[PDB]
Amino acid sequence: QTPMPQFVSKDGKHALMVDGAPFLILGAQVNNSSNYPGVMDKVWPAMQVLGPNTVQVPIAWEQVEPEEGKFDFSFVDTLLAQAREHKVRLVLLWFATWKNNGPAYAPHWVKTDNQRFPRVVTREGKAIGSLSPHAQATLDADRKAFVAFMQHLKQVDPQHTVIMIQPENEPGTYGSVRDFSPMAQKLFDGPVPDELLKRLNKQPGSWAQVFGADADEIFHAWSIGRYIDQVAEAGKQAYPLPMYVNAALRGPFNPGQPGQYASGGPTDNVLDVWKAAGPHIDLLAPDIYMPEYRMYTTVLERYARPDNALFVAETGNRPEYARYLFPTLGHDGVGWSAFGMDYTRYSNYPLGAKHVNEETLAPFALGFKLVSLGMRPFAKAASEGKLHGTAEEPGQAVQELKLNDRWSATITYGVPQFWFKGEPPGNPEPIGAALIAELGPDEFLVTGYHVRVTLHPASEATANMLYDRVEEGQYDGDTWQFQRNWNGDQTDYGVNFSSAPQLLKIKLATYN
Numbered sequence: 001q002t003p004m005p006q007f008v009s010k011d012g013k014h015a016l017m018v019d020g021a022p023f024l025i026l027g028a029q030v031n032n033s034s035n036y037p038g039v040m041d042k043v044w045p046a047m048q049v050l051g052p053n054t055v056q057v058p059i060a061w062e063q064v065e066p067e068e069g070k071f072d073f074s075f076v077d078t079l080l081a082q083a084r085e086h087k088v089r090l091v092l093l094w095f096a097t098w099k100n101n102g103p104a105y106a107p108h109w110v111k112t113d114n115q116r117f118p119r120v121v122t123r124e125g126k127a128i129g130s131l132s133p134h135a136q137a138t139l140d141a142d143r144k145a146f147v148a149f150m151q152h153l154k155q156v157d158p159q160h161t162v163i164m165i166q167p168e169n170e171p172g173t174y175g176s177v178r179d180f181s182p183m184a185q186k187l188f189d190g191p192v193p194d195e196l197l198k199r200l201n202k203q204p205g206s207w208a209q210v211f212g213a214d215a216d217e218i219f220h221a222w223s224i225g226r227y228i229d230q231v232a233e234a235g236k237q238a239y240p241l242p243m244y245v246n247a248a249l250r251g252p253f254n255p256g257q258p259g260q261y262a263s264g265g266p267t268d269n270v271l272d273v274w275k276a277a278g279p280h281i282d283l284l285a286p287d288i289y290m291p292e293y294r295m296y297t298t299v300l301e302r303y304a305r306p307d308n309a310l311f312v313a314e315t316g317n318r319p320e321y322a323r324y325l326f327p328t329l330g331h332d333g334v335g336w337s338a339f340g341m342d343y344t345r346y347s348n349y350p351l352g353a354k355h356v357n358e359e360t361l362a363p364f365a366l367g368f369k370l371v372s373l374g375m376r377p378f379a380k381a382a383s384e385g386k387l388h389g390t391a392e393e394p395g396q397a398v399q400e401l402k403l404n405d406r407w408s409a410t411i412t413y414g415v416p417q418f419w420f421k422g423e424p425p426g427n428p429e430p431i432g433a434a435l436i437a438e439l440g441p442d443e444f445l446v447t448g449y450h451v452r453v454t455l456h457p458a459s460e461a462t463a464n465m466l467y468d469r470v471e472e473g474q475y476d477g478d479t480w481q482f483q484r485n486w487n488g489d490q491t492d493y494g495v496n497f498s499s500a501p502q503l504l505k506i507k508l509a510t511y512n
Contacts, residue, residue: 021380030344031340051369068109103129118135154239167231177216178264190206217270220264288312293391311336322431370448387436417498451497455506
């Protein structure tokens with residue numbers, strides 16, 4: 001029997017297990033209103049070009065429980081059938097109590113009834129467009145619908161088309177650091193829970209006593225984390241798929257959205273608070289909409305932790321974003337997904353692309369194609385901490401990757417595929433990237449674009465380097481299929497990639 005999807009993490013190594021082996025998500029997310037049968041013909045032809053292995057689709061509380069107690073999962077059924085037909089897996093996004101801080105996707109009977117389902121209140125006493133995490137009614141209602149959803153999924157998806165769930169979407173609050181309602185203030189005045197004190201190694205006290213100036217934000221983060229953890233807990237009792245929460249980043253890390261001002265989500269300053277609050281939440285995923293290299297790679301480093309597998313749940317769909325797939329995979333987490341990938345003729349420019357079409361998909365499609373040529377062995381390498389990835393930084397034409405005790409790799413951008421004089425110039429725009437998996441001490445899987453990879457000795461022991469084999473080919477599952485051996489011009493100057501769909505399995509040797 002094929003096992004259900006499972007998230008495994010042990011001693012700083014992680015795997016998203018799908019059909020019994022590690023899996024790397026090569027993801028595409030449709031636009032926010034592309035979750036109805038009548039618009040799916042604007043989705044699948046885009047996915048046909050892009051070739052993701054996983055598609056993220058919203059499942060809206062307003063569409064599955066339009067009247068309280070009257071559930072309608074017909075769109076889930078339709079979407080499952082289509083995903084199977086188009087040969088992709090799914091990640092379903094539960095748009096419920098929070099979507100970008102707000103209740104807009106909650107049913108009419110929730111979002112219009114502030115007496116039953118109360119909004120956060122500011123210090124000055126005004127309600128703002130974010131539901132309070134302290135209200136029992138709201139939690140009970142979100143949780144009941146999420147349980148009905150997971151129970152349905154178990155029944156209709158024995159194929160395991162759906163591999164993860166995202167409960168809520170960028171939870172948090174824009175217009176206030178926390179809830180200042182009497183209901184909230186009563187809790188804030190109370191003692192910090194022992195669970196949190198233990199995680200942060202703090203002595204007992206009220207929230208203000210323990211955390212001082214940072215009490216408001218830490219309180220809100222804990223409170224939202226506990227809310228979603230209870231939703232996730234109940235959902236997993238029904239059907240234990242992996243689950244994650246996604247974070248709006250702060251300030252200059254999120255310069256193009258109002259969410260840059262959000263409090264209470266799993267931002268880099270409250271990750272430990274969220275780990276303590278959310279044992280039923282498998283990982284905390286960043287949404288990265290800043291194209292600058294040092295900033296982007298800093299986010300990857302901050303979210304990639306021994307206790308947190310890196311998943312880039314959302315990122316921009318402008319061409320400069322495509323290359324960040326490889327350094328993301330290089331953190332040996334579970335994958336990367338790009339946002340806004342359909343033909344519905346919507347644009348989130350200036351954040352994203354002005355137009356999504358067959359041409360502007362091309363830079364993203366290439367990376368997905370390259371990893372797909374070897375996805376299961378690449379995923380296995382990630383699960384062992386043996387996957388290396390890098391992308392081009394503007395103004396830096398050369399990078400160095402240490403692979404193991406024996407070998408390293410020089411990464412060179414914008415040079416010919418032949419002998420050349422002068423300095424490496426870099427590509428005209430930063431577009432290059434490489435991916436290298438260690439299969440054995442002398443064997444590597446290598447792919448890339450707009451790049452030269454030059455393997456070379458890391459020690460005196462390997463000084464007399466030779467290529468034993470440089471096999472172009474691909475995997476059918478776990479089975480290598482040989483096409484040709486590169487040699488001569490093709491291996492004289494490292495191995496060079498332009499934009500062709502090529503995967504190399506390279507075995508090194510020495511002469512004795």
